[PDB]
Curated annotation (Swiss-Prot), chain A:
The chain holds residues 157 to 206 of 207 of the full protein. This is Minor capsid protein P11. The hydrophobic region might anchor the protein in the underlying inner membrane. One of the minor capsid proteins that constitute a network internal to the major capsid proteins and outside the lipid membrane. The minor capsid proteins glue and stabilize the capsomers. the p11 zip protein binds together the neighboring symmetrons. Induction: Expressed in the late phase of the viral replicative cycle. Transmembrane segments: none annotated. It is found in: Virion. It comes from Paramecium bursaria Chlorella virus 1 (PBCV-1).
From Swiss-Prot, chain D:
One of the minor capsid proteins that constitute a network internal to the major capsid proteins and outside the lipid membrane. The minor capsid proteins glue and stabilize the capsomers. The chain holds residues 12 to 116 of 173 of the full protein. Interacts with the major capsid protein. The keyword Lipid biosynthesis does not apply. Transmembrane segments: none annotated. This is Minor capsid protein P8. The gene is A644R. Its main location: virion.
UniProtKB/Swiss-Prot annotation, chain E:
The lineage of its organism: Viruses, Varidnaviria, Bamfordvirae, Nucleocytoviricota, Megaviricetes. One of the minor capsid proteins that constitute a network internal to the major capsid proteins and outside the lipid membrane. The minor capsid protein P12 does not serve a cross-linking function between neighboring capsomers, it may play a role in the viral capsid assembly. The keyword Disulfide bond applies. Interacts with the major capsid protein. This is Minor capsid protein P12. Keywords: Capsid protein, Disulfide bond, Late protein, Virion. Induction: Expressed in the late phase of the viral replicative cycle. The gene is A139L. GO terms for cellular component: viral capsid. It is found in: Virion.
UniProtKB/Swiss-Prot annotation, chain K:
The chain holds residues 196 to 243 of 437 of the full protein. This is Major capsid protein. Induction: Expressed in the late phase of the viral replicative cycle. The viral capsid possesses up to five major capsid protein variants. They behave as asymmetric capsid components. It is found in: Virion. Belongs to the NCLDV major capsid protein family. It comes from Paramecium bursaria Chlorella virus 1 (PBCV-1).
Amino acid sequence: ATQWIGVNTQGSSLKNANYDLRADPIIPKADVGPWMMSSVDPNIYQKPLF
Amino acid sequence: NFLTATQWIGVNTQGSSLKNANYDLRADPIIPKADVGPWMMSSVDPNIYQKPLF
Amino acid sequence: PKNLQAQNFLTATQWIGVNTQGSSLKNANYDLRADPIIPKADVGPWMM
Amino acid sequence: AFPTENPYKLSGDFGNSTLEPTVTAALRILHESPAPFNTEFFSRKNVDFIQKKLISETKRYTSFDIGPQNEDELIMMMAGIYVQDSTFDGNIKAGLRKLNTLVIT
Amino acid sequence: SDYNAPNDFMKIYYSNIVEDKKLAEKYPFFGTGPFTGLRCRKPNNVGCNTTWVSGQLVELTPKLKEQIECKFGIQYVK
Amino acid sequence: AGGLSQLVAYGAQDVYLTGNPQITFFKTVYRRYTNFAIESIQQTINGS
Amino acid sequence: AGGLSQLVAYGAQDVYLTGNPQITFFKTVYRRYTNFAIESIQQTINGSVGFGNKVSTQISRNGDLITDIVVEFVLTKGGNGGTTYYPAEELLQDVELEIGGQRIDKHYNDWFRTYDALFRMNDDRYNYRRMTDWVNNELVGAQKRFYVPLIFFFNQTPGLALPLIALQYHEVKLYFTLASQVQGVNYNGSSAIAGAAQPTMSVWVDYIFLDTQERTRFAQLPHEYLIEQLQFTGSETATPSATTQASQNIRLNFNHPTKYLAWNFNNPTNYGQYTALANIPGACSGAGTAAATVTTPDYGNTGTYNEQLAVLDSAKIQLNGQDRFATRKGSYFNKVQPYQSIGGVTPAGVYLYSFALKPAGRQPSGTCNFSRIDNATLSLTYKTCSIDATSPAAVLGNTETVTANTATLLTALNIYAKNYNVLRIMSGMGGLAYAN
Amino acid sequence: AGGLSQLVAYGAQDVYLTGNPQITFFKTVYRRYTNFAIESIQQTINGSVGFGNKVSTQISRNGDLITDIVVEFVLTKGGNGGTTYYPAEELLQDVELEIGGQRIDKHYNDWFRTYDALFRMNDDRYNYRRMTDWVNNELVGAQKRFYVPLIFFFNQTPGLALPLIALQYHEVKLYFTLASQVQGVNYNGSSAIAGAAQPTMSVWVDYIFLDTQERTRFAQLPHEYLIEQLQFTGSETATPSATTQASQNIRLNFNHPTKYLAWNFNNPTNYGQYTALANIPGACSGAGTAAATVTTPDYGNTGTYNEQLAVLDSAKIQLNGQDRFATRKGSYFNKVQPYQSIGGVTPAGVYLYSFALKPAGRQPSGTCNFSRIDNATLSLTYKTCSIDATSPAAVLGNTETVTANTATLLTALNIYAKNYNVLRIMSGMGGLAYAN
Amino acid sequence: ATVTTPDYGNTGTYNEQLAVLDSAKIQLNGQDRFATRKGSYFNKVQPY
Amino acid sequence: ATSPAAVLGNTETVTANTATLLTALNIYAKNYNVLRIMSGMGGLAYA
Amino acid sequence: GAAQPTMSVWVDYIFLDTQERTRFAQLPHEYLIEQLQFTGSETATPSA
């Protein structure tokens, strides 16, 4: 499979990154509208440290 | 004999301003006013009364 | 030669540029619109 | 010996399309708005009648089997005869009877 | 501004801008000819007899028909 | 006037061109394709 | 790394480009074609060949289909370098095409010059010039073989090939008018060149032969081909010398659906001169030195690109007494319209207005039908011919509304229309479907 | 003998060519189309047209959809022949397309020059230059009408024409910024030209008029157009005169499936200069004689094909720290990628790397989607700028790793990303699907 | 006689040779309302 | 303008050199509107 | 000899308590805000 080169785990997640030490709350990708669809990811912290 | 109140356009009502006007002579069939998505909505009413002459 | 389903015999060449009857109407559609149909009762010498 | 299906210059000439009906095309060249007389005469059911009537009558007069005729030429003929003679007083059936008679002849 | 308050997100919108929801549900079609600009039921100009007043399109309920008919010379011909 | 004077000047002769149309020019549909990437890679030359 | 890195980088936007793939660019499958062979055959020219003579050829049913036709001439040049300008194109004054005596088309030498000016492009024009001219500074006495491909509907692509099989009763014939005057070959300006030779002429037809089952189908089936035709008649115009920018309303006598209207203004005595002459390079014999005379061109450089020496200021077309577009300046029709429609470069003095999105293509793309237009008018405005043509300081240093005093010689007006028809062939006979 | 002798030469190898025929080349089939008419209509400009001024125009709804748009300028030249270089598009400094209050994209004068320099070829590039510059050695004081076609997603092909009837609630408008300094018209280098006239401008929009049946569908049905847009942010470079080859890593900020990245290096003090100036023919003002000065170009000849004067030595594109391909020399991006991707000639100083097979077209053919790349970097290596620009013996007599000392002035880096988006139109309102 | 000061009591005249306007046209939404007329049309015929 | 020979005997499209003084352009329109009077107060119907 | 300016952009961030952060992150919001519309024009300042 073409990811034999390695998984791009960053994806798009840092384009609008969280620079806080507190994790951002999860904001689900709910109905938006036809002219302002985004393509980042929420970049949820995997370890909140709290 | 009062001209303002009719069946057609109704009572005490002006057609308001026209923006994004149809400069063409064609009817430019009306697309119903609706809000499709939360952003970049227009408050311009279509030129409803522009006669289907063709 | 009887199975002539691939043949196409009609040729409407005499019918291009035809007016309502033999008059010179400058066929050209000068009126940029609909031109609705005029009812025609076939009563000749005296219309009614 | 002979092919029974024509590799037309334009295949699927009328029918097999949703962009515009046959009637609208006729109305443009006529420069006329829709009316019951126009919408019946240039209808698919009337064109189908005419195509089948021509195939059956030809086979009755001759010994030859013919298929449907070039529709582009037929619709131009229908509109041409229509303009030259479209006489009715509102009696649509009587007018179509005369007009279809002229197209078939 | 109050903290212990409901989130007033588009509530004014849903009640006072939108698309005349209740009217449109009962009257899905638009006027086709001389009465273009009025909303009603059925194609052409049939399931109608609606009116436009100083603000928005409204249903011409018998109460409104009388309030206007008794004051203005409208014969309300269908 | 303008583009309208040409649209009304429509005749029987146009059925071959615009009658019962099959395509338009102003609403193109592009074909979807198999995803690929192009890369230029150094080869090793064997010899002097 | 590399391309694989690009691939594993995918997302929401991508579905619009690669979801549920329909084509793969790396698996082209070629279609199998009915067999055929191509050969070139020389036709008989009936009539005396020469300057001012008219000859014709009745084209033989040597093959099954006819496509490309090339007329060749062998000429000896009567002048030196720069004295000729498409001498084979001028000589071929016109070509008339008949099938069964029915006129299908007719092209003129000036149309060939306009066609080169508008629709030929991509170094084909240079090779074309090589076929029609002396392009290497050749001297008096040089002999050269010239080729003037014909540009009828069945000449430019096999898909419009004219069936020979299906025409058992109608002959295909071409008529050729050979110019009485060809610059640098038998005349230099208006003066005859003593000893000039008469041309050697030959008409070559390329035939296509079909295999067994295909040629059978061609004999059995009717044929409908999309036809390109030229509509033309010449007229006179009025170019003013001073104080005014003259207008002229020219009636457009056309009766078909068209791709475009194209026109030029020329000096009737100098084949291809569509601009004023001036004492600047390429626009005058002797340009740049005291011998310069702005009444005679440096013929070989006749085609130039500076619209300053062009006579047209603005043009509008009216259809049924209605403006078709707001009046545009001549530069629009010389440069802008052919840019967006053809993608070529048009020399100064030649203009086109299209009705089609792709007037250079075989695929129809929008037409104006002059069978339902009554008084169509081309309204032309000329710029004032006040610049002294002999003074470069003025020739290249003035306003948009004036041109040289020598533009008044461009008295011949040529308006062309490029239209549609359909050639129907059934039961051994051919003819046009539309004859208006 | 003849063609028949070839048809009989049927062998085993032909079952892949002429066996079980699928197509015949002698039967053109063209597809039938909706009736439409083309009209060019003048727009009203809101604001004062002039040097350094900003104006805007709202596009009227006179037709159903928009294809090309041509900006027309009228200029008076303030210098002698050779003092201008595409002044029409340098004046047209910024064009911004806005649909319903949302920006689509914007084009820069440098982008028009790059697009022209990169994608237009032969007859097309020349006719473009004719529309935007003075190309026939014209003199000071001459007046010329210029036409600058716009190149938005809907301007070169009708397939993506913008549907006005589908946009009854949104206004479509263009913003224009005009340059304050235009070489040879308002300024000569940094010096103002006294008496220079202000430009006159008009914006022409190509309107398409449809038939009623197609108009109804367009108005009522939702649409998705697959369109291209330009993304751009400028930057700066540095290259030393001697000791080292400069390296530079510029971080890119692009967001969509991208067809290609094109870039150039320029001297902002002039217009169109993408190479060093040198005392060789056409490479500086006065080149070849004692008056030659390598600080000022021979402006009308600014564009060159001599990459020796170009500053870039080599480059690679890196995505997330992983090289997308191994390092290439500047001449590779100038000569090979446009050879494979476009098929024309790219002048020196203009560089391209394509991700698409044929980015010159509009049918998608391979894209790099930068919305999924965390850090995209263009890594540059510059040539050593040690060659004395004034000595032809050293300028034309040197190696790959060195260029002229005047190359150090090409301090601006302009990277243009042409990429895909989706234009969604629903209930008379427009805008783009993705925005990041 | 002067031509800088009128004979004020006779200011109103009928000779269009002293008029400013050569021709006029009215356009509505970019379309002509009628074809161009000379100034005398508007002074003599429309009021007729 | 001072020579009757040139003023009263000239062409269709040429006027007096003194016409250049008529620099003020005055364009009038007469339109319809409606005066509504209710409860002692009047005003325009259309704005 | 004039020096180039050196820029620094400082942004005042608010750190909210946790409960309010949830309200902001997941609930939808409207703000009634100002914006500026601007185009340039030319004056007609007279002389004497």
